[PDB]
Amino acid sequence: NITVRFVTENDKEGWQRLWKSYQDFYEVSFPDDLDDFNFGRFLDPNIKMWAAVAVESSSEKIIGMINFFNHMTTWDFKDKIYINDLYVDENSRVKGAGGKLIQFVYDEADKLGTPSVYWCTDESNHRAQLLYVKVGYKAPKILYKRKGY
Amino acid sequence: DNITVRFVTENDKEGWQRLWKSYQDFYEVSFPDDLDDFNFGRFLDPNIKMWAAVAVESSSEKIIGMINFFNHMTTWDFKDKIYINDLYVDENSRVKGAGGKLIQFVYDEADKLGTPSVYWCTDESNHRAQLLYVKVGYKAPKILYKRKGY
Amino acid sequence: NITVRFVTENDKEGWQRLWKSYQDFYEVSFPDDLDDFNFGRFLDPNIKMWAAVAVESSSEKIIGMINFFNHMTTWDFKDKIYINDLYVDENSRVKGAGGKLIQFVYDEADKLGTPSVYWCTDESNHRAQLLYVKVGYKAPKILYKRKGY
Amino acid sequence: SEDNITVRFVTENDKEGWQRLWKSYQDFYEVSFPDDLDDFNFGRFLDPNIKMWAAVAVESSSEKIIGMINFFNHMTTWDFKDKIYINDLYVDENSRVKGAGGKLIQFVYDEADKLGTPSVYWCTDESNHRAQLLYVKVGYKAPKILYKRKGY
Ligand SMILES: CC(=O)SCCNC(=O)CCNC(=O)[C@H](O)C(C)(C)COP(=O)(O)OP(=O)(O)OC[C@H]1O[C@@H](n2cnc3c(N)ncnc32)[C@H](O)[C@@H]1OP(=O)(O)O
Ligand SMILES: CC(=O)SCCNC(=O)CCNC(=O)[C@H](O)C(C)(C)COP(=O)(O)OP(=O)(O)OC[C@H]1O[C@@H](n2cnc3c(N)ncnc32)[C@H](O)[C@@H]1OP(=O)(O)O
Ligand SMILES: CC(=O)SCCNC(=O)CCNC(=O)[C@H](O)C(C)(C)COP(=O)(O)OP(=O)(O)OC[C@H]1O[C@@H](n2cnc3c(N)ncnc32)[C@H](O)[C@@H]1OP(=O)(O)O
Ligand SMILES: CC(=O)SCCNC(=O)CCNC(=O)[C@H](O)C(C)(C)COP(=O)(O)OP(=O)(O)OC[C@H]1O[C@@H](n2cnc3c(N)ncnc32)[C@H](O)[C@@H]1OP(=O)(O)O
């Protein structure tokens, strides 16, 4: 089966492999040092930014990642948890990994006293949304960005 | 123009809280009064990256607008970004440029803070607000998902 | 102040005017033959395609236009009415002409036994939706078109 | 291995099967139409003087019906030619992801080409990702919002 747990120093390699695949998916290309910057934050206990990794109990191969972080809110005393990134190996999909990755964050946020978790996806991403409508719900909102950003 | 924007002061509480209450009525929600103090506390604390500004009528120092924003991380960049959480202008003070000035103020401060990436989100039914947002920004092709029950 | 009514032969020039302004708004260009084709169909009683016009009761200034037609549906025995076009004079806006034009269709559709009226609009058209949200409700649906069309 | 499904217009003999799918389609949409409407729709499909049609997806092996697509012709003030609207589309649960859905939409495209009315369109529920997974391949999401009269 599959299990999810926070990344360790040893998981850096498999995480970067998924991080690259993830960038390909989005058709983007981040600076190579941003990888090192992010992992540094996941490991720094004083920075509320984490990363969990899905691993197969048999092969023990890292098959999925989920990067998330904590931030404030004017609408409540408790902070919110935002899942920034989610990615499961194209060959390890539909096995329940994405769901177990999101569920892990739910459980972790509950322990942090910040259960209110949210995230966003591109509207045309129906593959991901098949999973999203099962673990959450589409907010009737529109996102606006500053021109050029 | 007779409308200027500026960060809140301890003396701007009464005005900000009134708009905060009216903002709540607009959203059909109701927050505990203790949250109003916590929010204002974070605004005033220079070491907490949560700010608030007010659109002030220059004729009379009457506060007619409110905008609450805060800084937060991102896995897509080394530097953080700004999220405009709340925006509200008095009914009698609408369509005078206050809304756009409040958003520009955040834009300017974002620039000074070295975190120019500013964003926000409105209800898909709020066309009055979007009439402005479409001029000062652009609609991102994204869908927002929330954890069930939240 | 403002009254709505089905177009007549004498409303041709006043209708073609708003037609062209409506075309400018959408940034498109239809041939002049379509102006005559559509208007022909409006006047022809056999064709279930209509057009109403908002007029200033003071004078006889055509300030508004609304084109609509009847079409089938598999979801009911009763046909539906689709409001294809709607344009109010740029100087006569926020007077209630739009609301009146849509209300007129509702009443005419009811007398036809086809009360189900609907229309679509650009997602970015917040000016029109400020009105639509008052006389209608946004369906939680997404429209798709054939590639190229 | 290869499925091999054939798509064709309904005949009086297809009634029983089409209706079975029509009912499942309603269960999916969580609606309930009177049995009379099923008869009316089929009546219109079979009537050549009424521009409403229905095609059905059949297995090449056994002439078992596994898919359905209901569509019709209507006017438009934006062109001389009319256009086509795919009102319904359903494929049996156990016959999905085998190319049936796409073939049905493609059949409508061809018939639209033959009729002189190539402009085909449809709409789906915003939350219907299973379907849009296919629609994005055969069509494109228009930047439009659908509005209906209150109570309807
Ligand atoms: C980052 C942002 O948040 S948005 C971008 C997210 N990332 C991506 O899109 C990257 C590319 N995609 C992926 O990595 C993956 O497809 C993900 C992460 C979107 C999903 O990961 P997966 O490991 O496949 O998730 P999971 O295993 O839970 O998916 C299976 C679920 O989808 C359902 N599903 C899949 N296909 C279908 C279909 N055709 N019809 C109905 N349900 C379907 C499954 O039935 C299942 O639901 P269930 O677990 O109750 O049975
Ligand atoms: C993230 C957020 O919190 S979402 C919710 C924001 N808050 C609300 O919606 C609360 C209720 N509404 C409000 O408080 C206000 O309507 C706001 C803040 C949304 C806008 O504030 P305002 O002070 O009225 O903004 P502003 O004066 O810039 O609005 C006018 C703008 O809308 C344009 N506009 C076009 N048509 C119209 C119309 N029919 N009515 C109003 N404005 C219109 C104006 O032309 C103008 O652009 P411009 O200044 O370049 O000419
Ligand atoms: C299907 C169609 O083809 S989609 C395209 C329709 N056409 C266009 O978009 C063309 C360009 N626009 C126009 O010609 C017009 O603006 C139209 C047709 C969209 C609307 O026509 P109008 O004559 O202005 O409509 P109407 O007079 O009813 O508009 C006033 C309504 O808008 C509301 N409204 C306008 N600005 C605001 C604002 N800032 N805040 C709240 N409500 C507002 C008014 O309150 C009012 O509602 P009410 O009549 O109950 O008081
Ligand atoms: C207007 C309309 O009526 S709206 C409602 C349409 N009807 C419904 O939703 C009823 C319930 N659903 C159904 O009957 C079916 O699931 C339908 C009609 C939506 C689709 O019918 P199908 O016969 O399965 O379609 P089709 O065979 O083309 O589906 C396969 C396609 O989906 C894609 N797909 C399926 N599951 C996935 C997944 N998990 N990830 C990525 N792509 C996927 C396939 O890649 C494929 O594309 P391809 O053929 O180029 O390889």
Tab-separated table of C-alpha atoms in Angstrom, chain A residues 1-114:
chain	number	residue	atom	x	y	z
A	1	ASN	CA	0.000	0.000	0.000
A	2	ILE	CA	0.877	3.704	0.257
A	3	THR	CA	1.739	5.891	3.259
A	4	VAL	CA	2.434	9.589	3.683
A	5	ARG	CA	4.895	11.241	6.040
A	6	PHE	CA	6.850	14.473	6.352
A	7	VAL	CA	10.025	14.738	4.295
A	8	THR	CA	13.444	14.085	5.876
A	9	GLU	CA	16.952	14.967	4.686
A	10	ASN	CA	17.004	11.658	2.804
A	11	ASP	CA	13.816	12.363	0.857
A	12	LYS	CA	15.291	15.442	-0.875
A	13	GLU	CA	16.261	13.474	-3.997
A	14	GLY	CA	12.858	11.935	-4.691
A	15	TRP	CA	11.123	15.204	-3.828
A	16	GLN	CA	13.173	17.160	-6.375
A	17	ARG	CA	12.361	14.500	-8.976
A	18	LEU	CA	8.631	15.109	-8.384
A	19	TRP	CA	9.243	18.868	-8.136
A	20	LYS	CA	10.759	18.779	-11.641
A	21	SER	CA	7.923	16.643	-13.023
A	22	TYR	CA	5.490	19.086	-11.376
A	23	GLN	CA	7.119	22.046	-13.139
A	24	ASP	CA	6.916	20.197	-16.478
A	25	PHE	CA	3.214	19.660	-15.857
A	26	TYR	CA	2.667	23.392	-15.284
A	27	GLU	CA	4.947	24.121	-18.263
A	28	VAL	CA	7.140	26.350	-16.077
A	29	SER	CA	10.776	26.424	-14.993
A	30	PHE	CA	11.866	27.638	-11.546
A	31	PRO	CA	15.480	28.533	-10.598
A	32	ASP	CA	17.479	25.436	-9.512
A	33	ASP	CA	18.269	27.043	-6.162
A	34	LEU	CA	14.571	27.479	-5.298
A	35	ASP	CA	14.504	23.714	-4.763
A	36	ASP	CA	17.164	24.046	-2.070
A	37	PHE	CA	15.388	27.073	-0.605
A	38	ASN	CA	12.074	25.221	-0.326
A	39	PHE	CA	13.531	22.043	1.167
A	40	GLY	CA	15.401	24.187	3.700
A	41	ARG	CA	12.040	25.602	4.839
A	42	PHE	CA	10.343	22.200	5.026
A	43	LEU	CA	13.113	21.075	7.370
A	44	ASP	CA	13.309	24.304	9.392
A	45	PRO	CA	10.885	23.723	12.320
A	46	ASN	CA	10.672	27.503	12.882
A	47	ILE	CA	9.180	28.111	9.436
A	48	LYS	CA	5.579	26.940	9.095
A	49	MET	CA	6.031	25.466	5.604
A	50	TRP	CA	6.002	21.705	5.229
A	51	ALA	CA	6.183	18.940	2.694
A	52	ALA	CA	4.923	15.396	2.973
A	53	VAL	CA	5.810	12.562	0.663
A	54	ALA	CA	3.830	9.504	-0.473
A	55	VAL	CA	5.797	6.261	-0.453
A	56	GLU	CA	4.930	2.698	-1.458
A	57	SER	CA	5.400	0.254	1.433
A	58	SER	CA	6.798	-2.398	-0.911
A	59	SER	CA	9.155	-0.629	-3.320
A	60	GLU	CA	9.704	2.220	-0.816
A	61	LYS	CA	9.901	4.537	-3.820
A	62	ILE	CA	8.716	8.126	-3.368
A	63	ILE	CA	5.667	8.463	-5.629
A	64	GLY	CA	3.978	11.695	-4.549
A	65	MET	CA	4.440	15.078	-2.881
A	66	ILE	CA	2.338	17.796	-1.302
A	67	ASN	CA	3.772	21.142	-0.227
A	68	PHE	CA	1.749	23.299	2.157
A	69	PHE	CA	2.080	26.210	4.565
A	70	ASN	CA	0.519	28.306	7.316
A	71	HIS	CA	-0.752	31.879	6.974
A	72	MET	CA	-2.897	34.439	8.775
A	73	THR	CA	-6.560	35.432	8.309
A	74	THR	CA	-8.585	38.524	9.218
A	75	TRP	CA	-11.672	36.309	9.426
A	76	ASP	CA	-10.538	34.200	12.397
A	77	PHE	CA	-8.068	33.813	15.270
A	78	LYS	CA	-6.828	30.532	13.813
A	79	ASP	CA	-4.501	30.580	10.810
A	80	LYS	CA	-5.264	28.709	7.566
A	81	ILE	CA	-3.238	26.000	5.828
A	82	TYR	CA	-2.703	26.369	2.116
A	83	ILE	CA	-1.719	23.422	-0.047
A	84	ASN	CA	0.503	25.080	-2.639
A	85	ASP	CA	1.570	21.987	-4.602
A	86	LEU	CA	0.300	18.446	-5.225
A	87	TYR	CA	1.880	15.855	-7.545
A	88	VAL	CA	1.737	12.064	-7.950
A	89	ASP	CA	3.954	10.155	-10.453
A	90	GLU	CA	2.137	9.667	-13.751
A	91	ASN	CA	2.617	5.910	-13.283
A	92	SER	CA	1.345	5.828	-9.700
A	93	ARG	CA	-1.929	7.663	-10.293
A	94	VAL	CA	-5.464	6.718	-9.217
A	95	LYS	CA	-4.061	4.333	-6.574
A	96	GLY	CA	-5.294	6.665	-3.826
A	97	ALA	CA	-2.033	8.598	-3.356
A	98	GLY	CA	-3.358	12.099	-4.017
A	99	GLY	CA	-6.210	11.486	-1.595
A	100	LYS	CA	-3.876	10.139	1.088
A	101	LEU	CA	-1.608	13.177	0.568
A	102	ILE	CA	-4.489	15.634	1.085
A	103	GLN	CA	-5.879	13.619	4.014
A	104	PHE	CA	-2.466	13.705	5.684
A	105	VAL	CA	-2.451	17.531	5.536
A	106	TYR	CA	-5.993	17.569	6.970
A	107	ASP	CA	-4.818	15.446	9.923
A	108	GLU	CA	-1.680	17.543	10.417
A	109	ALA	CA	-3.594	20.832	10.273
A	110	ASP	CA	-5.995	19.429	12.889
A	111	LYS	CA	-3.059	18.825	15.242
A	112	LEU	CA	-1.795	22.348	14.626
A	113	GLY	CA	-5.067	24.006	15.628
A	114	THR	CA	-5.428	25.311	12.073
